[PDB]
With several copies, the nearest count.
Chain A
């Protein structure tokens, strides 16, 4: 999946 930017650790 293209994941969009969300706040904080990009831990996924």
Chain B
């Protein structure tokens, strides 16, 4: 633990500074350090953790796709042999991406998920677990691809089950989970019908619960509902 000598509160403060500076790798390292203090995370702290790693892995995913596309072109019929470099460098980026995913899954497994008893924490972390398995799945091509996919599904499904029992249909965490699980279905599980059904049902059940909310909660819920709608527009 490179952050082992820094106070928890200082790590959180520095994570917030890092976010303002758009230094997401630093933000992620500070939040990793905070998690490794062993105390449970507050709502705000969970959001900092997620934002940091989401930004880091996002850069790597975008880079991977660029490189993958080039590599695929280099293997078309009529493309000139450019040598091993494209593959080597796509592998380098892929391996770093996988390391980031393993790091996050490691924090969730040691010991964020097992100590999370409230619905809002447990659903948040299990959604994250599904998400980072999904990012692994996006780059997986080996004999482990099926098990990675099944790990994503399993985490998403446990999260869905708790969210349906314990949260209202407008809960932004619940909505965000459904959004992400629907995308999992669509393009990881090759289940577009399931994707569409989940997104529709989720949208419709939130719509019918909006009347219960404050103006501020209404804004939070309708933001994610619009994402469901955006995908449904592309899918139907």
Contact B58 A12 (CB under 8 A): yes
Contacts of B65 in A (CB 8 A): 1, 12
Contacts of A11 in B (CB 8 A): 24, 54-59, 62
Contact A7 B51 (CB under 8 A): no
Which residues of chain A in 1-12 are interfacial with respect to chain B, using CB atoms and an 8 Å cutoff?
Answer: 1-2, 4-12
Contact A12 B61 (CB under 8 A): yes
B119 at the interface (CB under 8 A from A): no
B186 at the interface (CB under 8 A from A): yes
Q: How many residues of B contact A (CB 8 A)?
A: 28
Give chain A nearest CB distance to B89 CB in angstroms: 18
Do A6 and B59 contact each other (CB < 8 Å), given the known contacts A1-B65, A11-B54?
Answer: no
Contact B58 A4 (CB under 8 A): no
Q: List the count of A-B residue pairs having beta carbons below 8 Å apart.
A: 51
| Per-residue interface assignment for chain B, residues 54 to 73, with 1 indicating a CB less than 8 Å from any chain A CB and 0 otherwise | 11111101100100010000
Which one of A2, A7, A10 lies within 8 Å of B234 (CB-CB)? Answer: A2
Contact A6 B58 (CB under 8 A): no
Q: Which residue of A lies closest to B234 (CB)?
A: A4
Do A12 and B62 contact each other (CB < 8 Å), given the known contacts A5-B179, A6-B179, A7-B179?
Answer: yes
Contacts of B230 in A (CB 8 A): 4-5
Q: Enumerate 5 A-B pairs (CB-CB under 8 Å) in ascending A order.
A: A4-B230, A6-B180, A11-B57, A12-B59, A12-B61
Q: Could you tell me which B residues sit within 8 Å of A by CB distance? A: 24, 50-51, 54-59, 61-62, 65, 69, 127, 131, 176-177, 179-180, 183, 186-187, 224, 227-228, 230-231, 234
